[PDB]
Amino acid sequence: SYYIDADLLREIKQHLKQQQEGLSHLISIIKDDLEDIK
Amino acid sequence: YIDADLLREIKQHLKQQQEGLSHLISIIKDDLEDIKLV
Amino acid sequence: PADYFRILVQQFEVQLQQYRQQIEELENHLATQANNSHITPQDLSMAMQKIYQTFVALAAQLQSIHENVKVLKEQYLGYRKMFLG
């Protein structure tokens, strides 16, 4: 048996969806990845 | 960013996970210790 | 170390290693400010859901380990009453 606050967990989900990412930045990360892997 | 309130939320959540596992580990340790005591 | 005991110790170590890696990967990301900038908020949403799925597994194993050590004590107690009084 393990106690963990579920209200806090879904609260973390909301804050993650609400927050949006700059497309221009989102692409810089993708580029960097492809390069960093190849 | 990332937001600081969302950080404190995450930290609190992960901490809750550790406390949960640690609690179970404590029960196991008690069981092992009581075995020696019989 | 029978099969039941061996499969648990092994299945319990693989989840332990996963959890260890996932946490360190996340802590490092949230460690420095420049580090968070190298990941999207939806990467966290992943990591979080991944670490939790592992946590649930770990918690299940630790629980079953508690159950095993419990029957160990009971059997051990059974034998003692038989051969030691």
From Swiss-Prot, chain B:
O-glycosylated. It is found in: Nucleus, Nuclear pore complex; Nucleus membrane. Component of the p62 complex, a complex composed of NUP62, NUP54, and the isoform p58 and isoform p45 of NUP58. Interacts with NUTF2. Contains FG repeats. Belongs to the NUP54 family. Component of the nuclear pore complex, a complex required for the trafficking across the nuclear membrane. It is linked to Dystonia 37, early-onset, with striatal lesions: A form of dystonia, a disorder defined by the presence of sustained involuntary muscle contraction, often leading to abnormal postures. DYT37 is an autosomal recessive form characterized by the onset of progressive dystonia, dysphagia, and choreoathetosis in the first months or years of life. Affected individuals show delayed motor development and may have impaired intellectual development. This is Nucleoporin p54. The chain holds residues 454 to 491 of 507 of the full protein.
Curated annotation (Swiss-Prot), chain C:
It comes from the Eukaryota. It is found in: Nucleus, Nuclear pore complex; Nucleus membrane. O-glycosylated. Component of the nuclear pore complex, a complex required for the trafficking across the nuclear membrane. Contains FG repeats. FG repeats are interaction sites for karyopherins (importins, exportins) and form probably an affinity gradient, guiding the transport proteins unidirectionally with their cargo through the NPC. FG repeat regions are highly flexible and lack ordered secondary structure. The overall conservation of FG repeats regarding exact sequence, spacing, and repeat unit length is limited. In rat, the p62 complex contains two different isoforms of NUP58. Isoform p45 has however not been isolated in human so far. Belongs to the NUP58 family. Component of the p62 complex, a complex at least composed of NUP62, NUP54, and NUP58. Interacts with NUTF2. Interacts with SRP1-alpha and Importin p97 proteins when they are together, but not with SRP1-alpha protein alone. This is Nucleoporin p58/p45. The gene is NUP58. The chain holds residues 342 to 426 of 599 of the full protein.
